[PDB]
Amino acid sequence: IVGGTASVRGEWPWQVTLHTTSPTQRHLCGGSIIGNQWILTAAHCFYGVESPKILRVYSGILNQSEIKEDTSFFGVQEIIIHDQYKMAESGYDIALLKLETTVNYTDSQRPISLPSKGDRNVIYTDCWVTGWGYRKLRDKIQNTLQKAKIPLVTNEECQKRYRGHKITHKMICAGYREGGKDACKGDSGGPLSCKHNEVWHLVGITSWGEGCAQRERPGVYTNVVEYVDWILEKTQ
Ligand SMILES: O=C1CSc2cc(C(=O)N[C@@H](Cc3ccccc3)C(=O)NCCc3cc(Cl)ccc3-n3cnnn3)ccc2N1
């Protein structure tokens, strides 16, 4: 996350770090706990992943440096990628991980709610992007979970800035007109969480952007409310 600020333990308890272990262990992507056995994340996270065997999901993590070889994790039983996914920029950048076991929820691992039935027309004014990605275009995975508050831009404005892509109703955009704060490399799959009536909703999934925190170039996210039927279909 560019222009962001460090988080404290317990603060984003739905944020997971998804690790690949092939050929060596490293943070691959972020993700959100949406069910006891279910993580929501981005499809482009699995571009080089041979199978779920190599994946570890860590929850309750503030610092990447807490992950030692005795640190508990959740195996991934399944990666359900949307059948229409091809590449991030062309939408459908959504994926569920079915964990091998049920997360017992604690102070440090909690579910984030999906956007709610009847809230299609809520205007979300308190939205945050979280993750351990870069702080600039050429940087490194950060040790401490970063956070930045970012305003939603309308899909009409978002199309004016990305006239070489098709920005659809199944995408949601978020960024400052003068840049400065945004997601970046390694933040993919993570949440754009928004609080409405003091409840947090999983509004977005970090997908793609032209550079990081560039002015007039907003972050583009998978619009989760448009995939709720898909999510339920697949999680039932
Ligand atoms: O130990 C390491 C070495 S550094 C590292 C980088 C990435 C990475 O490139 N992630 C990409 C996604 C990706 C996943 C799999 C294969 C290839 C790429 C990403 O986050 N991409 C984030 C996309 C993005 C989203 C928004 Cl909302 C705004 C701006 C950006 N931009 C970041 N860079 N340019 N734009 C993932 C894990 C990593 N762990």
Q: Which residue segment(s) compose the domain that 128 sits in? A: 1-12+112-226
CATH number at residue 95: 2.40.10.10
Q: How far apart are CA 3 and CA 148, in angstroms?
A: 7
Q: How far apart are CA 21 and CA 11, in angstroms?
A: 27
Q: How far, in Å, is the centroid of ligand 1 from the Cα of 88?
A: 11
Residue 201's DSSP bridge partners are: 113, 194
- Is 108 one of the annotated active-site residues of the chain? no
Q: Does the beta carbon of 186 lie inside 6 Å of ligand 1?
A: yes
Tokens of 161: 């800035």
How far apart, in Å, are the Cα atoms of 115 and each of 34, 70, 136, 158, 219?
11, 36, 30, 21, 19
Q: How many domains does the chain have?
A: 2
- Residue 222: other Cβ atoms inside 10 A: 28
Q: How far apart are CA 169 and CA 222, in angstroms?
A: 9
Q: Which atom of ligand 1 is nearest to the CA of 133?
A: 20
Q: How far, in Å, is the centroid of ligand 1 from the Cα of 207?
A: 9
79 with 164, same domain: the answer is no
Q: Does the beta carbon of 143 lie inside 6 Å of ligand 1?
A: no
Q: Which of 7, 32, 59, 188 is catalytic?
A: 188
146 with 206, same domain: the answer is yes
Q: How far apart are CA 174 and CA 128, in angstroms?
A: 10
Is 173:221 a contact under the CB 8 Å cutoff? yes
- CA-based nearest residue to 190, from 163, 171, 208, 178: 208
Experimental method: X-ray
205 with 116, same domain: the answer is yes
Q: How far apart are CA 94 and CA 81, in angstroms?
A: 6
Tokens of 164: 């070489």
153 with 219, same domain: the answer is yes
Q: Which of 7, 19, 32, 44 is catalytic?
A: 44
129 with 218, same domain: the answer is yes
Name which residue sits closest to atom 19 of ligand 1, judged by CA. Answer: 185
Burial track 138-154 (b if 16+ CB lie within 10 A, e otherwise): eeebbeebbbbebebbe
212 with 236, same domain: the answer is no
Q: What is the full DSSP assignment across the chain?
A: -BT-EE--TTSSTTEEEEEE-SSS-EEEEEEEEEETTEEEE-GGGGTT---GGGEEEE-S-SBGGG--TT---EEEEEEEE-TT-S-GGGS---EEEEESS----BTTB-PPBPPPTT-TT-----EEEEES--SSSS----SB-EEEE--EE-HHHHHHH-TTS---TTEEEE--TT---B--TT-TT-EEEEEETTEEEEEEEEEE-SSSS-TT--EEEEEGGGGHHHHHHHH-
Contacts of 158 (CB under 8 A, 6+ apart): 167, 171, 173, 218, 220
Is 179:218 a contact under the CB 8 Å cutoff? no
Q: How far, in Å, is the centroid of ligand 1 from the Cα of 142?
A: 12
Q: Which atom of ligand 1 is nearest to the CA of 221?
A: 27
Tokens of 33: 């706990």
Tokens of 222: 């998978």
Q: Does the beta carbon of 217 lie inside 6 Å of ligand 1?
A: no
Tokens of 124: 């979300």
90 with 202, same domain: the answer is no
74 with 185, same domain: the answer is no
211 in the Ramachandran plot: left (φ > 0), alpha (ψ -120 to 50) or beta? left
Q: How far apart are CA 108 and CA 126, in angstroms?
A: 22
- Is 44 one of the annotated active-site residues of the chain? yes
52 with 151, same domain: the answer is no
Q: Is 124 annotated as a binding residue?
A: no
125 with 220, same domain: the answer is yes
Resolution (angstroms) stands at: 2.6
**Whose structure tokens read 């950060």?**
142
Is 209:215 a contact under the CB 8 Å cutoff? no
